[PDB]
Design a protein around this ligand. Structure first.
Ligand SMILES: Cc1cc2nc3c(=O)[nH]c(=O)nc-3n(C[C@H](O)[C@H](O)[C@H](O)COP(=O)(O)O)c2cc1C
Ligand SMILES: OC[C@H]1O[C@H](O)[C@H](O)[C@@H](O)[C@@H]1O
Length: 147
């Protein structure tokens, strides 16, 4: 199957999660294209993949990264029925609205018809060894849901 991952990372933590999730997935007989939101992918490309993984940190007042906002709006015009999807992000518990960018992206994927096959994965700030193992398990479980 063909997979796409779109992530956002300002201080590298969500990037580290993306690289380890995609690196695990890459060891299967599936292709995965990993794209940084700062390269401005158009949301219509999501329609062209069998599975979709989004990664995002949370920004001010429980919001999406600023660089995700145009893409998020463009998701209202895409059809994801049938696709398998999942979301992860780095987070900070000094904020009350903890990791809610993950929950916002999950909700939009649901609205467009994707089958969200994993709970959202939230890691506090920089992954530690246990967090990297969670990233491994996330990629492993995602692949199990494909066909
Ligand atoms: C201005 C600012 C606002 C933030 N707001 C939240 C928030 O509401 N909730 C949250 O969980 N983290 C929030 N954070 C924390 C970032 O999500 C956190 O530092 C994360 O590790 C960044 O991921 P990154 O390294 O991929 O950029 C915010 C951080 C900054 C600097
Ligand atoms: O792409 C726009 C339209 O796509 C689908 O039909 C959605 O279910 C509908 O709510 C939306 O208005």
């Amino acid at each position: 199957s063909k997979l796409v991952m779109i992530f956002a990372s300002m201080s590298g933590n969500t990037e580290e999660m993306a690289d380890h999730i995609a690196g695990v997935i890459r060891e299967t007989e599936n292709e995965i294209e990993v794209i940084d939101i700062m390269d401005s992918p158009e949301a219509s490309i999501l329609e062209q993949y069998d599975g979709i993984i989004l990664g995002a940190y949370t920004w001010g007042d429980g919001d999406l990264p600023d660089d995700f906002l145009d893409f998020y709006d463009a998701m209202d015009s895409i059809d994801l029925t049938g696709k398998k999807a999942a979301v992860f992000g780095s987070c900070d518990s000094a904020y009350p609205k903890y990791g809610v960018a993950v929950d916002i992206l999950i909700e939009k994927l649901q609205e467009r018809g994707a089958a969200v096959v994993l709970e959202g994965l939230k890691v506090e700030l920089t992954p530690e060894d246990e967090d990297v193992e969670k990233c491994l398990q996330f990629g492993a479980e995602f692949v199990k849901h494909l066909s």
